[PDB]
């Protein structure tokens, strides 16, 4: 099974992906 | 709409004559038509022989016969090159 | 309450005579749902002979109407002032068409 | 389920707050002259 | 013609109101029945939409013979109430009761 | 007044049309104000990185939700009895009967049962626990971030590629054939040889031990000797129990042919040897083109030299290289046509030759996967023709293409359209005529007068591959043939068993019903092609609008003059062909699903007898299989098929709502909206609130698009509910 | 847009700092409060029969939110309603969350503001930065040590609370 | 005050928790949720519809709209709270007048 801490590691990496998605979207938007 | 690049050494290959210019043969532009015709017949016989020797394919085949069987499709391109050179006076 | 009304019979051509189903009363045909049988029984018809006389009466009226349409366009066409009589037309269509029609049917 | 409190936290936020916030800010952005 | 905007805007509003409050009752019931919530439905068992005016008019027509049509012997139609008429063991006519489903399809 | 920042004509529209049109034109970067070609190619590159990251996030999410909430570890123990879980349900609108009814899967919470097949795919490639599903989800999350960063980076001023880089076709082709196609096929062969096959044989191999566990006992020494056949020795026995050591062999590269007898799937060593050979062939293919060292081919020279000397193709392919490199729509049309053919091959070859262990015993997954990839195929195939029409309108230059293959296509477009019209009518008249003939004759009680054509050509092709069911005795079916004897040592023993067992979907038996439905499919393909081809070839001009190219791809009409010109644009032929694509994939998936559910009961004769007239399709397929679906809830309760039962009705609603946009047009709605604008301005307490954008009716083209979206969505949702719920409810 | 005092501004810095100081107080208070068992029926699991499907949690045992979580949530719902009413209809003197956009921004403090021991803006900003830092510190400390946040607060403060 | 007062009643009588003893609590909180969503609607209307000028005594000005929104939120929560108090205490209001029969 998966522990909650492992879920929290997944949420941290998905947050980092959200920040990079915003920065790419703003670069595309100019 | 913008210049389309092609590699260095790109030349004009459009032909409206009986045969294309010998430039269409690439590195084989200087080979004579007699040499292509004889190489084509040689490659066809060796390729057909090697192909015939391995038609019942088994788990362990002779590797050289496999490589030699590739000469049959190569011979088609060789006799096309022989027709091109003979009609270019080479 | 047992026989199913049927007044349409098909010809046997391409297997289509399967449509002549067993409606009852020693008969085969297409079951009809227009309620004509109940109209005729309410009228008191009780026989096919009187239905032949009604069919002839319809044919005679049909000939008289097509004659009248020809006659009133090609021989005797009313002028516009005849058609522009709304009071006269209503008097005749209420009293004459509806009232006499109801009275004759009541008789 | 492990961390079973998470659907009961995240589903109302994602399903109600996230669209309510993007509708509000998209509405403001698309109706500004400058 | 000189107030056709007021006519078409009020008719348009009536059609929107009446589509929401007739067909949306059906959509509410499909959703509740699908969700397992049969007590949250518009039905006879659950929340009731009763056609009280039509039921009352049916009562009046069943009471009419001998009362407000005194020389009548029977009702104008057995659909309003009364006996079951059977001919050849098949029902000719019998009272057509109105419930929540009848309210909903009448507003449809 | 500033939302369509890419369009000054839309940002000054004072109506609600500005919002709609600004959203629908956002990704058409060529039409945006002040777009150069440099900036166009760089934005396409970055938004391709963003799309790639979206795909990796979707895959990581599916892996995460299965690792967290699924029963992968219970399913892996007993894969034919356990039903895979997709994700858990948390819906505060549920009642307690609904919460209880969806609590399947052996868990204590409501769940969706997965129809995607990801359990069988992850099981076959090695995954055994929840923790390596979770490790894979974290890897894809990292890769998604890396590609988001790469997209942002290549928009920075020093890292913005030039147009000369973007149009270096030769280098891209070399790298994409030998690295993206070839090397990754070789690396996937490595994964199967090193991980998937050992874990199919009970031995765990992961990142913690894979450098000290040899895939083969001999181990990379027969490869370096030419004794390659030592890797095919001792394959998995027919007694092998997948995932365990019992019956397992030691071979890693075999060519057995046929199916693993217990998983009913292709052998993993065949799949590994397939990817090794594909990898080598594609790496060889990727050395064809000249980049920097003087060997290889110029693409421009090959296109220029292929003019047949008889002159039947005109100038041949001279000038085609310039047009293709310059036009991105021509590239899109080729890519989409090519991709559409593959996803149709994916749909056809994965139901007949399944690769995943224990798949093909899951009927819902097989039905969902076939239907999904055929619908994707039909969309890709429509899009290829749409972007070919956009190519002709927008990117095609007649003076750089004098007497090409392209110009000569436009020179005999009337012949192609007229012949396509003939073949479609020839197929349509007679396929509908034979179907209606059979219907009347069966209805009149005489099925022996039906016109039942045996599909002998396809049966002969089946017999040529070894099917011994029609007595044709040709090629592989003939025991003493040159074809049968050549392959007797390798594939023929396993393949003959696979194709001559009536327990799989390899070359399913066919009869008159299959003949009639194949002709209907052919009619649908020709008619969809006719509208798309007519749209592409008449895109530049016609007799009604000879200057149609000056107006673009999507315009409403040319007005009521010249007899009327509604639906005259090339976009409108995309619009009209979308209905025919939906009809075509409908006939294909109805055929696949009815033939498969009747075989899965053991009642193939029900398809054989009822498929030759249309009432058999109406009562024995749609009406008969509707009953478990429409009883998902009723006045007596509900079960877990209630959600599909709701989606079914949902699909019927959207589809019908599409009719409103397609049948009723703009002038009516604009006059209604003007009476509502009056009413708002005159109503007290409500006229305190004012619109910033003037309410207008939708445009002519927008309404066609809105009706098409509603129609298509209703089509997809209705069929998805039926194909999943009927297969689940029946289980066969 | 973000010219209303939103984003990385000193207004946002001050507002977040005030919330963090209340949050440190609320974390200390709930740790002390559940250490002594002064939250009533803290373990009693709410019934879906009374509260509906919003109470469901899908932990294997009980399948419902506990009363302790519900009570803490209602406490924060009290201060959220006050928060919304103060954001949209603030007091006459109260510092506003959203600025006019024609306002002049407060000068950024820097590394440490001038030390003013009164009921000042400098003291408020110093304590707010310190409390936000405390929020992150307690979260990360609890995550790595493996202990719960309430027990972590008790150990960090030296088991005064329980 | 007017709108908040009548909002409580439909949520309480016809909501999902209507047959529970938390029906009035759920109805008030549902009224509160609608109030908060509507105040968000009023605020965004004010942001996008009015330019900033000093005039504050008219409804259709930026400050006048912000004042109206402030007052509407306070009065709405006040009227919903008053309706909660009245229904909580008076058994006539808890039924539809059905306590008399
Ligand atoms: C008593 C007088 C009388 C009667 C019965 C009618 C009857 C009719 N008129 Mg009218 N009409 C009348 C006077 C009358 N009209 C006058 C005075 C005017 C001038 C203002 C018009 C002007 C007028 C116009 C302009 C039109 C009619 C039309 C019609 C026909 C309506 C369609 C219909 O229901 O026919 C079907 C019902 C029937 C019962 C068919 C009956 C056919 C005959 C003609 C009825 C009378 C037969 C006879 C009196 C009965 C003898 C009974 C005997 C056996 C005891 C109907 C036949 C319309 C029409 O269809 O024209 C042909 C039409 O366009 N009428
Ligand atoms: C039907 C396919 C086909 C045909 C007709 C050709 C034809 C040719 N190739 Mg190509 N080639 C092909 C497939 C083909 N190739 C593939 C699949 C590959 C990838 C392995 C290559 C890779 C390749 C290279 C790397 C080179 C050629 C070269 C040549 C030319 C050599 C003539 C010769 O050997 O003189 C005797 C000739 C024009 C050479 C050349 O000069 O190209 C212009 C060269 O350097 N070929
Ligand atoms: C997308 C996800 C989603 C979620 C999680 C919910 C959640 C809920 N809905 Mg549903 N709803 C949704 C979408 C959703 N809705 C959609 C798309 C529609 C339109 C078809 C509806 C239509 C709908 C109706 C018609 C009803 C619900 C009801 C409910 C409540 C469940 C019943 C209950 O226990 O009563 C307990 C519920 C409460 C005690 C009230 C909760 C009030 C919230 C918590 C206040 C929040 C403040 C507000 C959101 C501020 C946000 C501003 C903005 C940024 C969003 C629950 C709050 C019922 C309801 O309102 O219950 C009263 C109800 O009658 N829903
Ligand atoms: C299923 C198909 C369908 C549907 C739903 C509609 C719907 C409608 N039509 Mg259309 N129409 C259709 C087919 C359909 N039509 C076709 C085929 C034609 C071809 C000739 C037309 C031609 C036509 C004309 C010519 C006219 C209409 C009018 C109307 C409206 C009637 C007023 C009304 O009921 O409002 C209430 C809306 C509904 C009942 C729609 C369903 C909504 C239900 C209750 C669910 C709501 C869900 C909710 C919004 C979800 C919110 C959350 C979500 C956003 C997440 C309504 C918008 C008339 C109109 O506009 O007058 C007012 C009108 O003049 N229609
Ligand atoms: C990899 C595939 C691919 C790519 C890159 C594109 C890209 C594009 N297409 Mg093509 N298209 C595709 C697949 C693809 N499409 C398929 C599969 C279909 C069939 C359904 C179509 C059918 C199609 C048509 C009919 C049209 C486009 C148009 C467009 C352009 C604008 C899209 C837009 O603004 O909507 C963005 C929409 C949103 C952001 C809202 C959601 C853009 C260049 C349009 C265009 O501008 O042509 C000139 C146009 O009219 N495409
Ligand atoms: C059941 C529905 C249906 C049917 C039968 C058709 C049929 C046809 N469509 Mg249409 N179409 C439909 C729905 C339908 N479409 C829809 C919903 C759309 C989306 C808008 C389209 C869009 C569309 C386009 C865009 C195109 C077609 C084309 C075609 C033709 C393609 C098949 C073919 O070539 O030969 C099949 C021929 C037939 C089915 C004709 C039937 C034979 C008849 C019934 C003879 C009977 C005579 C009878 C005695 C008459 C009785 C009269 C009575 C008063 C006595 C054909 C006329 C294409 C075309 O015209 O190709 C040339 C084309 O370009 N259709
Ligand atoms: C343009 C018409 C057309 C098209 C698109 C197709 C398409 C197809 N056919 Mg059909 N077929 C046709 C006409 C057509 N056929 C005719 C007229 C016959 C004779 C009755 C058949 C008999 C037939 C059989 C027996 C089988 C197929 C099958 C198939 C499929 C595989 C490909 C194949 O075998 O091609 C077949 C292609 C042809 C026969 C070429 C036809 C081309 C000409 C122009 C059509 C007209 C010929 C003319 C009227 C006859 C001349 C007069 C003669 C009587 C003296 C595919 C769906 C096979 C399949 O997979 O079934 C499931 C299969 O087994 N077809
Ligand atoms: C919120 C303010 C606050 C308060 C009132 C206290 C008070 C106390 N802490 Mg400290 N502590 C604080 C903040 C605080 N601390 C911070 C911010 C941290 C970092 C998370 C710690 C980490 C910490 C540890 C690791 C320990 C204490 C311990 C103690 C207690 C006894 C020994 C002592 O004087 O430690 C000296 C005071 C300090 C180190 C900080 C002042 C004491 C009553 C000890 C104890 O008894 O734990 C069970 C102990 O071992 N504290
Ligand atoms: C703690 C807590 C809460 C809270 C809170 C808040 C506002 C917490 C905010 C924390 C923030 C904004 C921390 C910012 C950190 C950035 C750093 C250290 C980088 C510097 C370079 C609330 C008020 C919800 C109550 C809750 O019962 C407990
Ligand atoms: C369509 C689209 C539009 C424009 C173009 C485009 C950009 C290319 C494209 C891309 C769109 C893309 C790619 C969109 C991608 C969107 C993504 C990846 C969104 C991810 C959101 C994750 C969140 C909010 C998790 C937060 C977790 C938290 C705060 C947990 C924190 C914590 C917990 C409790 C535990 C640990 C400690 C702390 C830190 C305290
Ligand atoms: C109904 C109808 C209208 C009226 C439809 C209108 C005015 C659309 C208004 C619908 C509301 C206002 C918004 C629709 C919201 C949708 C649920 C989706 C919103 C946007 C999402 C994509 C985010 C037309 O204007 C029209 C024009 C030409 C041919 C046919 C028709 C037609 O059939």
- HEC string for chain B: CCCCCCCCCCCCCCCCCCCCCHHHHHHHCCCCHHHHHHHHHHHHHHHHHHHHCCCCCCCCCCHHHHHHHCHHHHHHHHHHHHHHHHCCCC
F294, F307, F485 ranked by CB distance to B56: nearest: F485
Q: Which residues contact F375 (CB under 8 A, 6 or more apart)?
A: F585, F589, F716
d(CA B81, CA B15): 15
Indicate whether residue B5 lines ligand 2 (CB < 6 A).
no
Q: Which residue of A has its CA nearest to F68?
A: A2
Which ligand 8 atom is nearest residue G138's CA? 20
Burial F211-238 (b: 16+ CB within 10 A, else e): eeeebbeeeeeeeeeeeeebbbeebbee
Mutate to test the interface with H, among D25, D26, D27 (most CBs of H within 10 A): D27
Ligand approaching nearest to the C-alpha of F665: 11
Which one, of F601, F643, F597, lies nearest residue F621 by Cα? F597
CB contact under 8 A, F229 and B10: no
DSSP state of G57: -
CB contacts < 8 Å between B and F, how many?
72
With vertex at residue G45, the alpha carbon angle to CA G39 and CA G47, rounded to the nearest 5 degrees, is 125
Minimum distance, in Å, between the CA of residue D21 and any CA atom of chain H: 10
Written as six digits, the tokens of F108 are 């204590």
Please report how the helices G67-88 and H23-49 are oriented relative to each other, as an axis angle in degrees rounded to 10: 30
Sole residue written with tokens 């390798």 = F490
What is the rounded radius of gyration, in angstroms, for the C-alpha atoms of chain D? 15
Q: Which residues of E are annotated as a binding site for chlorophyll a?
A: 3, 10, 13, 21, 28, 37, 53-54, 58, 61, 68-69, 71, 106-107
Q: Is G63 on the interface with F (CB under 8 A)?
A: yes
Backbone angles phi, psi at E47, to 5 degrees: -60, 130
Residues from chain F that touch A13, judged by Cβ atoms under 8 A, are: 138, 141-142, 145
* F479 CA distance to ligand 3 middle (Å): 71
Contact between B56 and F489 using a beta-carbon 8 Å cutoff:
yes
User: Does residue F514 have its Cβ closer than 6 Å to ligand 7?
Assistant: yes
3-state secondary structure of F44: helix
Q: Which of A2, A13, A28 sits opposite F46 (nearest CB)?
A: A28
User: Testing the interface with F: which of E2, E13, E34 to mutate, by most F Cβ within 10 A?
Assistant: E34
Q: Which residues of F touch E34 (CB under 8 A)?
A: 98, 632-633, 638, 642-643, 645-646
**F666-682 and E4-34 helices cross at what angle (nearest 10)?**
100
Kindly determine whether residue E34 and residue F633, on different chains, have CB atoms separated by under 8 Å. Answer: yes
User: Measured between CA atoms, how close is B66 to chain F, in angstroms?
Assistant: 13
Is residue F125 within 8 A of residue F196, CB to CB? The reply is: yes
Q: Which residue in this structure is represented by tokens 């009248």?
A: C68
Residues F692, D31: C-beta atoms closer than 8 Å = yes
Q: For tokens 């309603």, what's the residue?
A: G81
Measure F684 CA to ligand 11 centroid, in angstroms.
26
On chain H, the residues whose CB falls within 8 A of the CB of F690 are: 49
User: With the C-alpha atoms ordered F204, F268, F227, B68, is the resulting torsion angle positive or negative?
Assistant: negative
- Against chain B, the chains showing at least 3 CB pairs within 8 Å are F
Closest listed residue to residue H15, CA positions, set H25, H5, H6? H25
Give binding residues of F as ranges.
557, 566, 652, 660, 668-669
Q: Two tokens at F418?
A: 């007229």
Q: Which residues of F are annotated as a binding site for [4Fe-4S] cluster?
A: 557, 566
Chain C residues whose beta carbon lies within 8 Å of the beta carbon of residue E91: none
Helix (H, G, I), strand (E, B) or coil at F406: helix
Contact B14 F307 (CB under 8 A): yes
D/F Cβ contact: 3+ pairs below 8 Å: yes
SS3 G64: coil
The verdict on the CB of residue E18 being under 6 Å from ligand 4 is no
CA G16, CA G109: separation in Å to the nearest integer? 15
DSSP string, chain H: -HHHHHHHHHHHHHSTTTTSTTHHHHHHHHHHHHHHHHHHHHHHHHHHH----S--SSSSSHHHHHHHHHHHHHHHHHHHHHHHHHHHH-HHHHTTSTT--
CA distance F668 to F74: 60
User: Is D34 in CB contact (< 8 Å) with chain F?
Assistant: yes
Residue of D nearest to A5 (CA): D3
Helix axis angle, G10-35 to G67-88, nearest 10°: 150
Which candidate in H33, H37, H45, H48 is best for mutational testing of the D interface (most D CBs within 10 A)?
H48
Neighbours of chain E (3+ CB pairs under 8 A): C, F
CA–CA distance, G86 with G69 (Å, rounded to integer): 25
**Whether F145 and A17 lie within 8 Å, measured CB to CB:** yes
Q: Which of G70, G38, G68, G76 is nearest to G51 (CA)?
A: G70
Establish whether residue F591 lines the binding site of ligand 7, counting it when its CB lies within 6 angstroms of any ligand atom.
no
Cα distances (Å, whole numbers) of residue F325 to B5, E85, F63, F295, G40: 9, 85, 39, 22, 74
The ligand placed nearest to the CA atom of residue C95 is: 1
Q: Which residues in chain F are contacts of C15 at CB distance < 8 A?
A: 441, 444-446, 449
Q: Which residue has the tokens 């070399």?
A: F174
List residues bridging with E85 in a β-sheet.
Answer: E93
Cα–Cα distance measured from residue F688 to residue F683, given in angstroms and rounded to the nearest whole number: 9
Contact G58 F109 (CB under 8 A): yes
Cα atoms found within 13 Å of the Cα of residue F620, Cβ hemisphere only: 20
Of the residues D26, D28, D29, D34, the best mutation for testing chain H's interface (the one with the most H CB atoms within 10 Å of its CB) is: D28
Query: If you ran DSSP here, which 8-state letter would residue F682 be given?
Result: H
Burial class (CB in 10 A: 0-12, 13-18, 19+), B65: middle
Per-residue three-class SS string for E1-51: CCCHHHHHHHHHHHHHHHHHHHHHHHHHHHHHHHCCCHHHCECCCCECCCC
Q: Are E25 and E42 contacting, i.e. CB atoms less than 8 angstroms apart?
A: yes
Long-range contacts of C32-39 (CB under 8 A, 24+ apart): C32/C5, C32/C6, C32/C7, C32/C8, C33/C5, C36/C5, C36/C7, C37/C5, C37/C7
What contacts B40, CB < 8 A, 6 or more positions away? Answer: B75, B78, B79, B81, B82
Residue C87 — φ and ψ, nearest 5°?
Answer: -65, -45
CA separation for the pair F624, F189 (Å, rounded): 46
From which experimental method does this structure derive? cryo-EM
Q: State both tokens at C28.
A: 């085969």
Ligand 5 atom with minimal separation from the F552 CA: 48
Locus of tokens 């998604």: F144
Q: Residues 292-321, chain F: which have Cβ within 8 Å of B?
A: 294, 296-302, 304-305, 307, 309, 315-316, 318, 321
Q: Closest Cα to residue F42, out of F159, F146, F175?
A: F159
- Residue E40, min C-alpha distance to chain F (Å): 10
Strand partners, F15: F694
Chain H residues 22-81 within an 8 A CB cutoff of chain D: 37, 40, 44, 47-48
Neighbours of F525 (CB within 10 A): 18
Of all atoms in ligand 6, which is nearest to the CA of residue F523?
32
- In D, minimum Cα distance to H41 occurs at D24
Interface contact F167-B16, CB threshold 8 A? no
Quick check: do C and A touch, 3+ CB pairs under 8 A?
no
Asked if D7 lies within 8 A of F88 by C-beta distance, the reply is: yes
Which chain F residue's Cα is nearest to B2? F326
Q: Which helix (H) or strand (E) element contains residue F98?
A: helix F96-101
């Amino acid at each position: 099974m998966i522990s909650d801490t492992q879920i929290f590691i997944a949420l941290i990496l998905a947050l980092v992906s959200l920040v990079l998605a915003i920065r790419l979207g703003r670069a595309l938007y100019q | 709409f913008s210049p389309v690049p092609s590699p260095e050494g790109t030349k004009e290959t459009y032909w409206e004559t009986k045969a294309p210019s010998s430039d269409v043969l690439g590195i084989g532009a200087g080979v004579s038509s007699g040499n292509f015709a004889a190489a084509s017949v040689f490659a066809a016989l060796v390729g057909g022989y090697c192909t015939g020797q391995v038609i019942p394919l088994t788990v362990e085949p002779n590797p050289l016969f496999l490589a030699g069987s590739f000469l049959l499709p190569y011979s088609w391109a060789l006799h096309v090159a022989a027709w091109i050179q003979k009609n270019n006076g080479k | 309450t047992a026989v199913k009304p049927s007044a349409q019979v098909v010809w046997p051509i391409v297997g289509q005579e399967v449509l002549n189903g067993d409606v009852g009363g020693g008969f085969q045909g297409v079951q009809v749902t227009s309620g004509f049988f109940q109209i005729w029984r309410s009228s008191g018809i009780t026989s096919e002979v009187e239905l032949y006389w009604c069919a002839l009466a319809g044919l005679i009226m049909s000939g008289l109407m097509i004659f009248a349409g020809w006659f009133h366009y090609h021989k005797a066409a009313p002028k516009l002032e005849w058609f522009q009589n709304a009071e006269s037309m209503l008097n005749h269509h209420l009293s004459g068409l509806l009232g006499l029609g109801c009275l004759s049917w009541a008789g | 389920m492990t961390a079973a409190y998470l659907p009961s936290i995240l589903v109302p936020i994602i399903g109600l707050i996230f669209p309510g916030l993007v509708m509000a800010f998209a509405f403001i952005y698309i109706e500004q002259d400058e | 013609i000189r107030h056709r905007d007021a006519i078409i805007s009020h008719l348009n509003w009536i059609c929107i109101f009446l589509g929401f409050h007739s067909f949306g009752l059906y959509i509410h019931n499909d959703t509740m029945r699908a969700l397992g919530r049969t007590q949250d439905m518009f039905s006879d068992t659950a929340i009731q939409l009763k056609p009280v005016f039509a039921q009352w008019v049916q009562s009046i027509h069943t009471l009419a013979p001998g009362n407000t049509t005194p020389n009548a012997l029977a009702t104008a139609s057995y659909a309003f109430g009364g006996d079951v008429v059977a001919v050849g063991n098949k029902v000719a006519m019998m009272p057509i009761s109105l419930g929540t489903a009848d309210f909903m399809v009448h507003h449809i | 007044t500033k939302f369509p920042k890419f369009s000054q004509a839309l940002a000054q529209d004072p109506a609600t049309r500005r919002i709609w049109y600004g959203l629908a034109t956002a990704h058409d970067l060529e039409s945006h104000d002040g777009m150069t070609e440099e900036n166009l190619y760089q934005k396409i590159f970055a938004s391709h990185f963003g799309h790639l990251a979206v795909i990796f996030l979707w895959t990581s999410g599916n892996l995460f939700h299965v690792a967290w909430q699924g029963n992968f570890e219970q399913w892996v123990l007993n894969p034919l009895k356990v039903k895979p879980i997709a994700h858990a349900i948390w819906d505060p609108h549920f009642g307690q009967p609904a919460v209880k009814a969806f609590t399947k899967g052996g868990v204590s919470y409501p769940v969706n049962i997965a129809t995607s097949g990801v359990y069988h795919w992850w099981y076959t490639i090695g995954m055994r626990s929840n923790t390596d599903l979770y490790a894979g989800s974290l890897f894809l999350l990292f890769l998604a971030g890396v590609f988001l960063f790469a997209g942002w980076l290549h928009l920075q001023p020093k890292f913005r590629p030039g147009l000369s880089w973007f149009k270096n076709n030769e280098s891209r082709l070399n790298h994409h054939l030998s690295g993206l196609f070839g090397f990754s096929s070789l690396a996937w062969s490595a994964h199967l040889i090193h991980v998937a096959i050992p874990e199919a044989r009970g031995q765990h191999v992961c990142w913690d031990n894979f450098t000290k566990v040899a895939p083969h006992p001999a181990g990379l020494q027969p490869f370096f000797t030419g004794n390659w056949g030592a890797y095919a020795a001792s394959p998995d026995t027919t007694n092998h129990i997948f995932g365990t050591s019992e019956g397992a062999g030691t071979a890693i590269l075999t060519f057995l042919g046929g199916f693993h007898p217990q998983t009913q799937a292709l052998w993993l060593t065949d799949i590994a040897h397939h990817h090794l050979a594909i990898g080598v062939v594609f790496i060889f293919a990727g050395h064809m083109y000249r980049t920097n060292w003087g060997i290889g081919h110029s693409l421009k020279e090959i296109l220029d030299a292929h003019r047949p000397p008889g002159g039947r193709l005109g100038a041949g392919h001279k000038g085609i290289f310039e047009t293709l490199t310059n036009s991105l729509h021509f590239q899109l049309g080729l890519a989409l046509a090519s991709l559409g053919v593959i996803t149709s091959l994916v749909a056809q070859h994965m139901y007949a030759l399944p690769s995943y262990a224990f798949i093909a015993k899951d009927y819902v997954t097989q039905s969902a996967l076939y239907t999904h990839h055929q619908y994707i195929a039909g969309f890709l195939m429509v899009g290829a023709f749409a972007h070919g029409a956009i190519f002709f309108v927008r990117d095609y230059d007649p003076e750089q293409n004098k007497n090409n293959v392209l110009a000569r296509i436009l020179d005999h477009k009337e012949a192609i359209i007229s012949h396509l019209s003939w073949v479609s009518l020839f197929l349509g008249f007679h396929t509908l005529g034979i179907y209606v003939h059979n219907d009347v004759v069966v209805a009149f009680g005489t099925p022996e007068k039906q016109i039942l054509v045996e599909p002998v050509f396809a049966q002969w092709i089946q017999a040529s591959s070894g099917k011994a069911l029609y007595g044709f005795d040709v090629l592989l079916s003939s025991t003493n043939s040159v074809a049968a004897n050549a392959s007797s040592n390798i594939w023929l023993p396993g393949w003959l068993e696979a194709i001559n067992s009536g327990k799989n979907s390899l070359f399913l038996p066919i009869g008159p019903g299959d003949f009639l439905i194949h002709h209907a499919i052919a009619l649908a393909l020709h008619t969809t092609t006719l509208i798309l081809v007519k749209g592409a070839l008449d895109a530049r001009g016609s007799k009604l609008m000879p200057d149609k190219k000056d107006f673009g791809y999507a315009f409403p009409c040319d007005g009521p003059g010249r007899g009327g010109t509604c639906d005259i644009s090339a976009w409108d032929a995309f619009y009209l062909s979308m209905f025919w694509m939906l009809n075509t994939i409908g006939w294909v998936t109805f055929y696949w699903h009815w033939k498969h559910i009747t075989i899965w009961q053991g009642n193939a004769g029900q398809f054989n007898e009822s498929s030759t007239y249309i009432m058999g399709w109406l009562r024995d397929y749609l009406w008969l299989n509707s009953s478990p679906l429409i009883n998902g809830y009723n006045p007596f309760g509900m079960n877990s098929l209630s959600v599909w039962s709701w989606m079914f009705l949902f699909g019927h609603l959207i589809w019908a709502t599409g009719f409103m946009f397609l049948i009723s047009w703009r002038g009516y709605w604009q006059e209604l909206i003007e009476t509502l604008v009056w009413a708002h301005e005159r109503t007290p307490l409500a006229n305190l609130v004012r619109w910033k954008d003037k309410p207008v009716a939708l445009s002519i083209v927008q309404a066609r698009l809105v009706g098409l979206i509603h129609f298509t969505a209703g089509y997809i949702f209705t069929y998805a509910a039926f194909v999943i719920a009927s297969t689940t409810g029946k289980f066969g | 847009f973000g010219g209303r005092g939103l984003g990385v501004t000193v207004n946002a810095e001050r507002w977040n700092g005030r919330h963090a100081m209340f949050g440190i107080f609320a974390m200390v208070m709930t740790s002390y409060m559940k250490g002594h068992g002064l939250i009533p029926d803290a373990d009693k699991v709410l019934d879906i029969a009374q509260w509906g499907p919003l109470a469901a949690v899908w932990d294997g045992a009980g399948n419902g939110i506990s009363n302790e979580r519900a009570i803490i949530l209602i406490a924060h719902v009290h201060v959220l309603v006050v928060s919304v009413i103060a954001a949209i209809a603030p007091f006459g003197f109260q510092d506003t969350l959203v600025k006019e956009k024609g306002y002049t921004p407060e000068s950024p403090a820097g590394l440490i503001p001038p030390f003013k021991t009164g009921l000042t803006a400098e003291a408020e900003l110093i304590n707010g930065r310190l409390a936000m830092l405390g929020v992150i510190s307690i979260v990360t400390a609890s995550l790595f040590t493996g202990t719960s946040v309430v027990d972590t607060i008790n150990l960090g403060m030296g088991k005064i609370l329980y | 005050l007017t709108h908040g007062y009548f909002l409580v009643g439909p949520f309480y009588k016809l909501g999902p928790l209507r047959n529970s003893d938390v029906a009035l609590l759920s109805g008030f909180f549902s009224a509160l949720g609608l109030i908060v969503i509507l105040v968000a609607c009023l605020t965004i209307y004010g942001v996008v519809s009015f330019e900033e000028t000093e005039a504050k005594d008219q409804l259709q000005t930026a400050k006048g709209w912000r004042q109206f929104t402030s007052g509407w939120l306070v009065g709405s929560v006040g009227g919903a709270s008053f309706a909660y108090i009245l229904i909580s205490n008076i058994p006539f209001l808890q039924t539809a007048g059905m306590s008399m029969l």
